[PDB]
Each structure stands twice: as C-alpha cells, then as structure tokens.
Amino acid sequence: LTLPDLPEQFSPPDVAPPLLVKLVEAIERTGLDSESHYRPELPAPRTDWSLSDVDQWDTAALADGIKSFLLALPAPLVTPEASAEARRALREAPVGPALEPPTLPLHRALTLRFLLQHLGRVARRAPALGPAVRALGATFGPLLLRPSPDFPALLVEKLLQEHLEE
Amino acid sequence: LTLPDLPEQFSPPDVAPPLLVKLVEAIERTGLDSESHYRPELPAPRTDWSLSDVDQWDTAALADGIKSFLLALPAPLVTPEASAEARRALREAPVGPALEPPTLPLHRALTLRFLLQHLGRVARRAPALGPAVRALGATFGPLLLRPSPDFPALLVEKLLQEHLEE
Ligand SMILES: [Cl-]
Numbered sequence: 001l002t003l004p005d006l007p008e009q010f011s012p013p014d015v016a017p018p019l020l021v022k023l024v025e026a027i028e029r030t031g032l033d034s035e036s037h038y039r040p041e042l043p044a045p046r047t048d049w050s051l052s053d054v055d056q057w058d059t060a061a062l063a064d065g066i067k068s069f070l071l072a073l074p075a076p077l078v079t080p081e082a083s084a085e086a087r088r089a090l091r092e093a094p095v096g097p098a099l100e101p102p103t104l105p106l107h108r109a110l111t112l113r114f115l116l117q118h119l120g121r122v123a124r125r126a127p128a129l130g131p132a133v134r135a136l137g138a139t140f141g142p143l144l145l146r147p148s149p150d151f152p153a154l155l156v157e158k159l160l161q162e163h164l165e166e
Numbered sequence: 167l168t169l170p171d172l173p174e175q176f177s178p179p180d181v182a183p184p185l186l187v188k189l190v191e192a193i194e195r196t197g198l199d200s201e202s203h204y205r206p207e208l209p210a211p212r213t214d215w216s217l218s219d220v221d222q223w224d225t226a227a228l229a230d231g232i233k234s235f236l237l238a239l240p241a242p243l244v245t246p247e248a249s250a251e252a253r254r255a256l257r258e259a260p261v262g263p264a265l266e267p268p269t270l271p272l273h274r275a276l277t278l279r280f281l282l283q284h285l286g287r288v289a290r291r292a293p294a295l296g297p298a299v300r301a302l303g304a305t306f307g308p309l310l311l312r313p314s315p316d317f318p319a320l321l322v323e324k325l326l327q328e329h330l331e332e
C-alpha cells in the first residue's frame with residue numbers, strides 16, 4: 001500500500017506533504033492531550049488515502065494515520081546516507097545539520113521538520129518534557145529509519161531535544 | 167486502493183498530478199505508436215504508487231497505470247455537477263466550457279486538460295484520426311465519469327474533437 005515518493009507528493013511553495021499536513025492539523029485541533037501519539041504498535045495497513053472524512057476521525061485514527069504515512073513511503077523518510085551521517089555525528093557528539101540538505105534531500109528534510117514541529121507540540125503538552133521526548137523517540141525512530149539497536153530512537157530523541165532548545 | 171483527492175496531490179505552479187505526469191511522459195518517450203491506450207479492459211488493482219521503476223515499464227503497464235490513476239481517485243475526475251452541465255450542453259448542441267472552473271474545480275480541470283493533450287497526441291499517431299478519437303472516447307469516458315448509456319464516451323469524444331480543432 002505504497003504512496004508516491006515525497007518529491008511526487010508536493011513541491012515548493014508547499015513545505016510538507018498535504019496528507020501529513022491534513023492529519024497533523026486535524027490532530028492538533030482535537031487531541032494534543034492524547035496518549036495515542038506515544039503508542040509504538042503498528043496500525044492496520046492503510047489502503048484508503050482519500051482522507052475524505054479525516055475531520056471526523058478520533059485521535060487514535062489520526063495518530064495511526066501519521067504512522068501509516070511514514071510506513072507507506074517507498075523508502076524511509078531518513079535516508080541510509082543521512083542515517084549514517086547522523087550516526088557519525090551522534091557517536092562523536094548536534095545531529096540536526098546531518099538531517100538537512102544536501103545530506104537529507106529537500107522534500108524529506110521539510111517533511112522531517114514538519115513532523116518534529118508536531119512532535120514538539122505533543123511533547124510540551126505532556127506532564128514531563130524529558131520522558132515525553134524519550135517515549136516519542138522510541139515510537140517514531142523505527143518509523144523514520146526502518147551499531148546500537150536503539151539508534152533510531154536515540155536519533156529522534158536528540159533531534160526533538162534540539163528542536164525544543166531553539 | 168485510493169489515492170488522495172486531486173487538491174492534495176498537487177498545487178500551482180504545477181499544472182497536473184505528478185503521478186499522471188510521470189506516466190504520460192514515460193509513455194510518450196517510448197510508446198505513442200501503441201494500441202494499448204485504446205484497450206477498455208480494467209487493469210489489476212494497483213497498490214504500489216511509488217512509480218520507483220516507471221521508466222523501465224512497457225507501454226501496456228504505463229497505459230494501465232494511467233487507467234489505474236483515474237480509477238484510484240476518491241471520486242471521478244469529472245464531477246456529477248460538471249457531467250450534468252456537459253450533458254445539458256451536449257444535448258442542446260461546444261462542451262469544453264462546461265468542464266472548466268468553476269463548473270469543474272481547478273485541479274480536476276487542469277488534470278483533464280493534461281490528459282486530453284496526451285490523448286490528442288495518441289489520436290494523431292493513429293492511421294485515421296476520427297476512428298481513433300472514437301475508440302479513445304469509448305475507453306476513457308467511463309474512467310472519467312464512472313440518459314444515453316454512451317454519454318461518457320460521447321462526451322470525451324467531443325472534448326477530444328474540440329481539443330484537436332484548436
Ligand atoms: Cl526526498
């Protein structure tokens with residue numbers, strides 16, 4: 001159930017994929033105070049990407065939608081090249097630059113930025129920022145990357161931490 | 167196996183959906199002299215819309231891709247409102263204006279124009295223009311619209327005829 005690659009989903013002056021934008025805007029009107037964002041379970045495979053009734057969806061459906069979007073891309077959001085460059089920076093410890101162009105291509109970088117902005121807003125609603133950032137890393141790491149076995153989680157955790165600093 | 171609606175697939179300054187653009191450009195480099203465009207049989211349902219290897223596809227696969235694109239939209243390319251306004255013009259006989267904004271929304275009109283341009287190029291490769299235009303109407307009519315039972319075919323036939331005049 002594979003979506004087009006990110007360059008085929010949007011172009012500047014748009015700064016994020018419309019499907020992701022629709023899910024994020026929906027979920028942020030209704031359910032930023034939800035635990036659903038933090039759930040690492042994979043949703044049932046999505047075949048209907050119309051989002052025809054997305055504004056009537058419950059927070060769980062929307063959170064699942066965001067996860068399904070990431071899993072539906074033909075290749076992971078964070079590329080192997082970008083992963084390896086983050087890994088080298090993260091090991092030799094700011095990972096942020098590693099996940100920007102040219103290292104991470106424009107569409108992917110924009111998409112990652114849009115997602116991190118959303119995940120920051122979720123984190124800030126939580127009772128404790130640090131634990132939230134950690135839980136969100138554990139959930140979204142594997143979705144974005146698809147050697148330490150927690151590297152994906154640690155990378156997203158650090159990227160979110162850096163976003164929140166700024 | 168439903169794609170996003172056309173407004174979620176592209177925005178100006180793009181003038182057509184990238185997936186359709188990729189299939190059309192592919193098919194027009196390789197196989198404008200093919201009978202495959204004229205085949206009314208429905209393709210197997212497509213679930214992979216990555217087009218990751220689209221430039222290695224045979225003409226039959228590409229022609230099927232274009233048909234699958236039209237069938238994968240959440241609602242027909244030509245709206246019921248636009249269909250009824252074309253039907254009234256076509257009955258009282260130029261249908262063209264009826265399938266332009268506001269009657270047919272911007273994204274759909276742009277997409278229809280891009281497709282008709284492609285179908286015109288196919289028609290002009292054929293041994294006889296009139297018969298080709300008729301065969302293409304019969305094939306694409308039902309895909310675009312989803313009372314005369316040949317109305318969809320007649321509408322596309324006339325729209326293509328009008329395009330070729332200009
Ligand atoms: Cl990209």
Ligand SMILES: [Cl-]
Binds near residue numbers: 272
């Ligand atoms: Cl539209």
